[PDB]
Write a protein that binds this ligand. Structure first.
Ligand SMILES: [Mg+2]
Ligand SMILES: [Mg+2]
Ligand SMILES: [Mg+2]
Ligand SMILES: [Mg+2]
Ligand SMILES: [Mg+2]
Ligand SMILES: [Mg+2]
Ligand SMILES: [Mg+2]
Ligand SMILES: [Mg+2]
Ligand SMILES: [Mg+2]
Ligand SMILES: [Mg+2]
Ligand SMILES: [Mg+2]
Ligand SMILES: [Mg+2]
Ligand SMILES: [Mg+2]
Ligand SMILES: [Mg+2]
Ligand SMILES: [Mg+2]
Ligand SMILES: [Mg+2]
Ligand SMILES: [Mg+2]
Ligand SMILES: [Mg+2]
Ligand SMILES: [Mg+2]
Ligand SMILES: [Mg+2]
Ligand SMILES: [Mg+2]
Ligand SMILES: [Mg+2]
Ligand SMILES: [Mg+2]
Ligand SMILES: [Mg+2]
Ligand SMILES: [Mg+2]
Ligand SMILES: [Mg+2]
Ligand SMILES: [Mg+2]
Ligand SMILES: [Mg+2]
Ligand SMILES: [Mg+2]
Ligand SMILES: [Mg+2]
Ligand SMILES: [Mg+2]
Ligand SMILES: [Mg+2]
Ligand SMILES: [Mg+2]
Ligand SMILES: [Mg+2]
Ligand SMILES: [Mg+2]
Ligand SMILES: [Mg+2]
Ligand SMILES: [Mg+2]
Ligand SMILES: [Mg+2]
Ligand SMILES: [Mg+2]
Ligand SMILES: [Mg+2]
Ligand SMILES: [Mg+2]
Ligand SMILES: [Mg+2]
Ligand SMILES: [Mg+2]
Ligand SMILES: [Mg+2]
Ligand SMILES: [Mg+2]
Ligand SMILES: [Mg+2]
Ligand SMILES: [Mg+2]
Ligand SMILES: [Mg+2]
Ligand SMILES: [Mg+2]
Ligand SMILES: [Mg+2]
Ligand SMILES: [Mg+2]
Ligand SMILES: [Mg+2]
Ligand SMILES: [Mg+2]
Ligand SMILES: [Mg+2]
Ligand SMILES: [Mg+2]
Ligand SMILES: [Zn+2]
Lengths: 91, 135, 252, 63, 77, 112
RNA sequence: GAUGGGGAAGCUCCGUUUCAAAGGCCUGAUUUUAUGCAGGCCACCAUCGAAAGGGAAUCCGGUUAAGAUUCCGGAACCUGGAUAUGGAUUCUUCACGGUAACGUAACUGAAUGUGGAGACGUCGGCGCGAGCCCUGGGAGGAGUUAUCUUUUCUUCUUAAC
RNA sequence: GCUUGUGACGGCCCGUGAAAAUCCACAGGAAGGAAUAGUUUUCAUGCCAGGUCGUACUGAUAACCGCAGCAGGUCUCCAAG
RNA sequence: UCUAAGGGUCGGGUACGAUCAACUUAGAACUGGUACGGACAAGGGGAAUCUGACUGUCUAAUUAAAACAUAGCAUUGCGAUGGUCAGAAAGUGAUGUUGACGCAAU
């Protein structure tokens, strides 16, 4: 029974702060509360609390992640960059 | 193969004797009116032979090397089978189903296995089996 | 006239960091034998939140090379590291995220955090949620290693200066609008008494160089010289250009 | 005496009402009351096999 | 602060040397469903506990009271 | 109708000033300042309440028997039993692999 | 906020583990004797700062002109100190039992190391506990009764341990 | 039902919501211990001791502060139909 | 003064019965000097201009506002041998348990 035409979670703030701001928050708020895939056991049970802290329901591992998503772009790019550089120093 | 045959060493992985090494003597590969699980009859070592050095003399050595044993009915699901293996012959008879029930019976079995294991330790046989597993 | 606000800050009274809750002070291992001849393993025992700090912290346990005991250091958690992970610190340690290596021993293009100005000062550069430094140079004689910092400034330091491979966790924390005074409030609540801010221009002249007048105005240039003296320096200090910054920045 | 006439449905008229229908008896109370009955009727209908487990599992999520 | 049931251990208690006093108490209660009966509580005071043995049976009571160490200042009722 | 009073000087409702109300043989109510509840000890490895172990306020454990503070097994009142299972496996396997990693590089040495 | 210190003409200012030779425990060595030395540790470096934070342990009944978790009575509990008697344990020296989660009246354990408790936001509904509220029968006492009311009112309690 | 206590959950955070005293436990195995008799005081029972200071009452339209037995101010717990 | 609907608990070989206790909600008659949220309790509404976005703040004792604050926006200084600030001095101090997704200054 589609409740809100667009504000979704952001409907809590009602009318205040301006649409544009409410929009920006909704984006990253959608990210942070959302429940993510575990790199380790592979159930979708990773969730936040405390920016940067993504810890996993069952299996109980915590990963240091992006402020509102498990992985930053720039972080992951660095991942592949290190990968690359690492390779160079053995082959 | 059926690696849980009657020579295998395996470390008990649960219950009181968790962490202690044992040997199988007789496997009941499936079933008991009681024990409805794959369970082994093992002879193990409860209190290990404490290490002994040059400085150790006379009656202290003979004391440091006393061994306290145990016998256990134990589910297969509770021992890590090992590649290592120890001979069973001296207490084939002594460790049996009949051995359990009646306390009196159990101790005699332990007396044998104790005299067995101690004879065995000195003269260097098996060595690893007398070494404490540290975890 | 009075004593303006920003000169009151210096005595440290109501100001002084709000420090009760913090995990302790993050820093690399002390740069000892183990760390500067070989490497040394560690277990991240817990990644955890330091109050008043955007970036999450990584508690990491190590053996003590000289006494039978466990010794726990406190690291800023690079993105990607995880409870249970092993961490290798040393010259002869290896190029993976979260390990710590002396700047001279990672190739150009590597990415590191918490890097030392001088070797062993236990980490100084790039500690903020999301920041880092990139190695861009090596001069094997006078063994330096040029890096570019978060600011942009390039700067050369010792090849024995240590850094940790990766990026600091919690990046992007600033893309989210505070939305309301309350969140800003709680923000500074666990930092220090710097919020909210009265505009000097709303003060009387006792209080400020910006103070007074019958409309609110600044009444003179708001750019102030480096050589200004306390009670003067408030506006755009030693500014060298001013106004909207048009055109791509990014230092060349 | 009054209480008596009350359980006979008396003085519960539209004009003897002062808190909203909600306050007087919350919606959710009705729902939980009702859903726990359907939910726990299914148990016995399955636990005795009138209902087969597949039908149950549908009726559950349908309830 | 203690309830006892083995009539032996009791008797042993009553010769325990730190035990200089005792006291019997008598209660009319009712039995099972219908009738009433005479309950009897045997209370030994030890240095750190007061043990009380409830002999429900009318009979065992009487026999018990004469069993009693003739050096124990038993407070009747 | 019957209303109670604090039984101690401390008049504020702090954690160390909990109350319970109680009916006494005199047929009246009174208060009875209740000790904070004790929490259960926790496993050093995982984090669970470790079963087998009694739960007392921490000095109380010195007024209790040894059996109340352990369970019969390597790391009794210390680790969560399933966790022992694990340290036991890991230890074995690592120490075995260790032996394999030794003689296989003893191979390396001669043939290289 | 003392202290090796560092400033200051100086009253004093700064520093709190700080650029310092910063201290003490377990017993052994004594059988001239009371405590010198033999080890081995531990380098933690004052102290003040909460009658709302942390924190060993007590209850009910009686009692006074006025005190009561403080007296009286009975019944407990904690901490320190001494200690013996019964158990348990050992000829397989340092308990057995359960496949296991675990069990128990016990069931030696120095240095050292490690773990846990102490020890912790807020709001929401859901579950349960207690005390209160409401109420049936009965067994007592009170009120109303020109008439009506198997009625109105009240007693029926159970502490720590 | 009402106060209140508690549990297993859930919402929130660029806020993730003290400290030390103190108590226990495990890893360790120094060392000490029996058959003509040893070990054991984390089992039970038994013995001694527990100082110093506060403790009345008021806590408010009269016991506090407001020149006062001032219509002001001044922290909190219990709470019937 | 009635009506209807909404629950619990028990045995059933491997459809139903028997009983316990609850105020909610809708409907229908009858009834009165047309009264009935009967006391108590309990928003006036609407169309505009000016102005501050909002919630919040202040002149205790003549000013509560359009003033201050805020999020949002923009600018400035700074890589530690540093920026800003304290001190008579110093083996001194705030920021700093800090490092540009930071601190400081408009
Ligand atoms: Mg042991
Ligand atoms: Mg001035
Ligand atoms: Mg400070
Ligand atoms: Mg302020
Ligand atoms: Mg401002
Ligand atoms: Mg401003
Ligand atoms: Mg003004
Ligand atoms: Mg001026
Ligand atoms: Mg000027
Ligand atoms: Mg002006
Ligand atoms: Mg202006
Ligand atoms: Mg609803
Ligand atoms: Mg309900
Ligand atoms: Mg139901
Ligand atoms: Mg489903
Ligand atoms: Mg009553
Ligand atoms: Mg009092
Ligand atoms: Mg509270
Ligand atoms: Mg236990
Ligand atoms: Mg227990
Ligand atoms: Mg001083
Ligand atoms: Mg003090
Ligand atoms: Mg106190
Ligand atoms: Mg207190
Ligand atoms: Mg009294
Ligand atoms: Mg008196
Ligand atoms: Mg009085
Ligand atoms: Mg007394
Ligand atoms: Mg007494
Ligand atoms: Mg004692
Ligand atoms: Mg026994
Ligand atoms: Mg500890
Ligand atoms: Mg802790
Ligand atoms: Mg607290
Ligand atoms: Mg008590
Ligand atoms: Mg309250
Ligand atoms: Mg939390
Ligand atoms: Mg404990
Ligand atoms: Mg020695
Ligand atoms: Mg004892
Ligand atoms: Mg003294
Ligand atoms: Mg008093
Ligand atoms: Mg009083
Ligand atoms: Mg008065
Ligand atoms: Mg006065
Ligand atoms: Mg007055
Ligand atoms: Mg009906
Ligand atoms: Mg029915
Ligand atoms: Mg406004
Ligand atoms: Mg005014
Ligand atoms: Mg004035
Ligand atoms: Mg106003
Ligand atoms: Mg006014
Ligand atoms: Mg704008
Ligand atoms: Mg100097
Ligand atoms: Zn997982």
């Amino acid at each position: 029974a589609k409740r809100t035409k667009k504000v979704g979670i952001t409907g809590k703030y009602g009318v205040r702060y301006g649409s544009s701001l409410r929009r920006q928050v909704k984006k990253l708020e959608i990210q942070q509360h959302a429940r993510y895939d575990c790199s380790f056991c592979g159930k979708k049970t990773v969730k936040r609390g405390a920016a940067g802290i993504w810890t996993c329901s069952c299996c109980k591992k915590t990963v240091a992640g992006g402020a509102y998503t498990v992985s930053t772009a720039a972080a992951a790019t660095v991942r592949s960059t290190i990968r690359r550089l690492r390779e160079m120093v053995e082959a | 193969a059926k690696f849980l045959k009657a020579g295998k060493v395996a470390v008990v992985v649960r219950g009181r004797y968790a962490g202690k090494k044992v040997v199988i003597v007789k496997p009941h590969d499936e079933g008991s009116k009681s024990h409805p699980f794959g369970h082994a009859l093992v002879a193990g070592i409860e209190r290990y032979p404490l290490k002994v050095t040059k400085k150790h003399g006379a009656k202290k050595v003979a004391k440091r090397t006393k061994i306290k044993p145990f016998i256990k009915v134990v589910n297969y699901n509770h021992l890590l089978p090992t590649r290592y293996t120890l001979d069973v012959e001296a207490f084939k008879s002594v460790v049996s189903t009949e051995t359990f029930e009646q306390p009196s019976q159990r101790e005699e079995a332990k007396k044998v296995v104790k005299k067995a294991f101690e004879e065995r330790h000195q003269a260097g046989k098996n060595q690893w089996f007398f070494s404490k597993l540290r975890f | 006239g009075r004593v303006i606000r920003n000169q009151r800050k210096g005595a440290g009274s109501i100001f002084t960091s709000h420090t009760r809750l913090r995990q302790g002070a993050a820093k690399l291992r002390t740069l000892d034998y183990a760390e500067r001849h070989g490497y040394i393993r560690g277990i991240v025992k817990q990644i955890v939140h330091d109050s008043g700090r955007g970036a999450p912290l990584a508690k990491v346990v190590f053996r003590d090379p000289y006494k039978y005991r466990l010794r726990e250091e406190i690291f800023i958690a690079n993105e990607g590291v995880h409870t249970g992970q092993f961490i290798y610190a040393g010259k002869k340690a290896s190029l993976n995220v979260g390990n710590v290596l002396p700047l001279g021993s990672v190739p150009e293009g590597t990415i590191v955090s918490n890097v030392e100005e001088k070797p062993g000062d236990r980490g100084a550069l790039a500690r903020a949620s999301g920041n880092y430094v990139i190695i861009i140079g090596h001069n094997p004689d006078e063994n330096k290693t040029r890096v570019r910092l978060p600011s942009g400034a390039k700067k050369v330091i010792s090849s024995d200066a240590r850094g940790v491979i990766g990026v600091i966790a919690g990046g992007g924390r600033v893309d989210k609008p505070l939305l309301k005074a309350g969140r800003a409030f709680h923000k500074y609540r666990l930092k220090r008494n710097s919020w909210p801010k009265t505009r000097g221009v709303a003060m009387n002249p006792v209080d400020h160089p910006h103070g007074g007048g019958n409309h609110q105005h600044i009444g003179k240039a708001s750019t102030i010289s480096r050589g200004a003296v306390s009670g003067q320096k408030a506006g755009l200090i030693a500014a060298r250009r001013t106004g909207l910054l048009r055109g791509s920045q990014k230092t060349q | 005496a009054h209480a008596q006439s009350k359980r006979e449905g008396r003085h519960s008229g539209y004009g003897k009402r002062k808190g909203t229908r909600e306050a007087r008896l919350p919606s959710q109370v009705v729902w939980i009351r009702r859903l726990r009955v359907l939910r726990r009727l299914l148990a016995k209908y399955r636990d005795a096999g009138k209902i087969d487990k597949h039908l149950y599992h549908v009726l559950y999520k349908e309830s | 602060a203690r309830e006892i049931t083995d009539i032996k251990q009791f008797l042993e208690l009553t010769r325990r040397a730190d035990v200089k006093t005792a006291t019997v108490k008598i209660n009319k209660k009712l039995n099972k469903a219908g009738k009433p009966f005479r309950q009897t509580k045997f209370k030994v005071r030890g240095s750190s506990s007061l043990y009380t043995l409830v002999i429900n049976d009318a009979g065992k009571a009487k026999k018990l009271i004469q069993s009693l160490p003739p050096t124990l200042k038993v407070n009747r009722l | 109708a019957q209303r109670v009073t604090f039984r101690r000087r401390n008049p504020y409702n702090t954690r160390s000033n909990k109350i319970k109300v109680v009916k006494t043989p005199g047929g009246i109510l009174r208060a009875q300042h209740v000790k904070k509840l004790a929490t259960r000890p926790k496993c050093g490895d995982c984090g669970s309440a470790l079963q087998g172990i009694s739960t007392l306020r921490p000095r109380q454990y010195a007024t209790v028997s040894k059996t109340h503070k352990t369970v019969s097994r390597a790391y009794g009142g210390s680790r969560c039993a399933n966790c022992v299972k694990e340290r036991i496996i890991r230890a074995f396997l690592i120490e075995e692999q260790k032996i394999v990693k030794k003689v296989v590089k003893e191979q390396t040495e001669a043939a290289k």
